[PDB]
């Protein structure tokens, strides 16, 4: 129909330290299966 509130795009809220909390866990375990800050997270190429 229309807008009667405020122009505010949709957004998601994650905590700032949680993503580092899970990071150190997978990182430490990743050192076993894969060669051991050499870990790089990059966006997908696309398509």
């Amino acid at each position: 129909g229309a807008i009667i509130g405020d122009i505010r795009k949709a957004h998601c809220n994650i905590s700032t330290e949680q993503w580092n909390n899970t990071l150190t866990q997978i990182v430490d375990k990743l050192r076993e299966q894969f060669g051991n800050k050499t870990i790089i997270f990059n966006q997908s190429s696309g398509g």
Partner: antibody
Amino acid sequence: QVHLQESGPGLVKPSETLSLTCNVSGTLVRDNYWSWIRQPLGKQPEWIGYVHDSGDTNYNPSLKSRVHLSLDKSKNLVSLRLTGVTAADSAIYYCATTKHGRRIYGVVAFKEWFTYFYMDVWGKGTSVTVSS
Amino acid sequence: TFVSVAPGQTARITCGEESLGSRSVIWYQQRPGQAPSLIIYNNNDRPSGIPDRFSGSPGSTFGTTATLTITSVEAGDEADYYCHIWDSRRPTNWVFGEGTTLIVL
């Protein structure tokens, strides 16, 4: 105690590059923002806008044709100049300071805030009229 | 746009359009033959030099209209009142609204 003095010839010929001046009182122009207000005789005031050195030289969007604001740091003077005065320019003008104000209603990074200005003090002004 | 209120009574002033979005209303007054001044510098915040008698509506209203409530009108209240809306929807409006000239008997 804040007071200021203006100038003007009183009678201005049509189609003349009229110039107006406004001085300061104690406060320097570098650390302050100035605004001009035009009020027709007996009607609601009209806001020209605000001018400030180093980038903040926004003018009135409605006119954006002949308005020209300049500053003189050495003389501590601000000048207002119009080119091609018309018959509808007969109004009282006011040069005065303004104060900022912030409001946020959304995400800090998505530009949901607009600065609003309020004039704590107002100038004495000088009458300008056009005749033949 | 002329309002007649007897001394010592309550007064209501209506200014601005419908509340499509949030507002930050600024209230101004004009004295005949004297420079203007300020009363309220925000939606509800006020500067020094004036008591808490003045009141206003918050800017979190949708579909309503900005209003001003004045009580215990005195002899010094005779002045022209102007409103300045500040909406996030429309650009900054450089023309003030219909000034309400409040006269006291």
